[model samples]
Target: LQKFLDEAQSKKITKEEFANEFLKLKRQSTKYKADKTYPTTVAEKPKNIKKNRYKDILPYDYSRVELSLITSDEDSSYINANFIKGVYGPKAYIATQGPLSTTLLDFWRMIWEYSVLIIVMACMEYEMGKKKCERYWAEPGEMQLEFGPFSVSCEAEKRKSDYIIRTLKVKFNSETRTIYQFHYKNWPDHDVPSSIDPILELIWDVRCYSVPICIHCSAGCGRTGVICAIDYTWMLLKDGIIPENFSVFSLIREMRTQRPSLVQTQEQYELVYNAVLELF
Candidate 1:
């Protein structure tokens, strides 16, 4: 472990150096494969395949969020989600695909089952003439919306410059809990932002320390990975890990151990480096 610690202590690099290292790792990624042996059998099973948004993007069995199938479908427990490890510990965040109309109730089941108090949305309800995610909560004017055994209602909502925060009350068996949903509307599905300021601002806005924040986008892998990588930095920073010890490379791989293809592109990967450089 000393070698790893020494590497951490001496790993600090300048912004220019980081930009160059991004290319270094960029080339390495094509040849370097990871965890291919991890079985996605549950996701591929005939009963669960329809729950996934992208058939190829499946959750690893080892780290998947295994919900207890209620007196519901014999195969009702599976969802396109995983328990991602944070800098703090395992199951720190749940990265999931945006719910389809059919899986919206299953989404609520996962939320109520996990006691998820905060949710970070990285994509819009509808984007570029496509429905990216289905509505999981009731319309502000609508009354209570039922999802199997749970009820969801949007009690309040506040629009921000780059995002919107909705205060939702979710009830199961007559007991209620308040959940804060931070929907980042500015980021589109196709590309990275022109500036990193919005992401930085969104990070602080979504900060609900210690609560297992549920985060999603359309596929829950592309843009979702971007925010996951950036948000994790705060946990390290607040936990007293200095920039000198930080390694976006290590962090990316760590998250991938729990979820598939997190931080998916050259630009997206660099955005992670860009955010870390703000501290380095």
Candidate 2:
């Protein structure tokens, strides 16, 4: 980490050297594609499951974050989700796409089963006339909404120019839990955030609690991948790991194995490098 940061700040090498490295990393990302046919891959997934997926380009299976069979209907049992492991610790996360209206029940089931305490939503519902995500939670003053047997109500909301934070209370069958939801509105599809401080700050805030967080964007790869990658890198840096020993390319390479097409575009790939440097 010191080496790259030093290069960015030092006058020893031409700026062209930095450009070449960036381009090289981008090229390497393209060559590292996801393999959908791993040993845990689900053969013959139900047709209804496919309809819940955000992008066919980056298909995920139910092997990792598979919901326990809590319902009688098998066709509605699947959810487009996967478990993501961190670098230096057992701190893990679930990465999934924004819920479709049809799969809202399945989404809540996964949360209840996994005991997920935080949900990081990184995209808006409609972006430029395209449907990014269905409205899964109740709006500001709506009180409560039901999905299947579970009930969800917004306890409180804090709005800002860059993002919105909500305290959500979920109840089911005499049991209940509170989940924090962070909705970042400034991030655009297939692009990085305009500034990294708001997101970098959010990462710190989420880590204050020691529970698995569910992060999602439209497809659950591009922006979701960036946040996970940064969070992973931040952990390493916080523990005194050197930048020279780390490779952003290798980090994203391993991530794609679980969540396909993570770190989607080359520009996004480059932003990962820059975002890490900004932390220093």
In Å, residue 202's CA in model 1 sits off its true spot by 1.7
Task: Name model 1 segments beyond 4 Å from true.
Answer: 1-35, 69-75, 242-246
lDDT of 1 by residue, 1-280 (tens): 1214334435644455545654454422245574355778889988889999887788888888978747376537789999887776787889999998788877888887888988888887889987888878676877888877777889988888898888988877768888888888886554556477878888887773355779888889778787888878766766766555347777776766677777666677767766755644
Off by over 4 Å in 2: 1-4, 8-44, 58-63, 69-77, 88-91, 192-194, 242-244
What is the lDDT for 62 in model 2?
35
Clashes of 2: 3
In candidate 1, position 13 carries an lDDT of 42
Sliding window of 10 residues with minimal summed lDDT for model 1: 1-10
* Every candidate's CA RMSD: 4.6, 3.8
Error of 1 at 177 (Å): 1.6
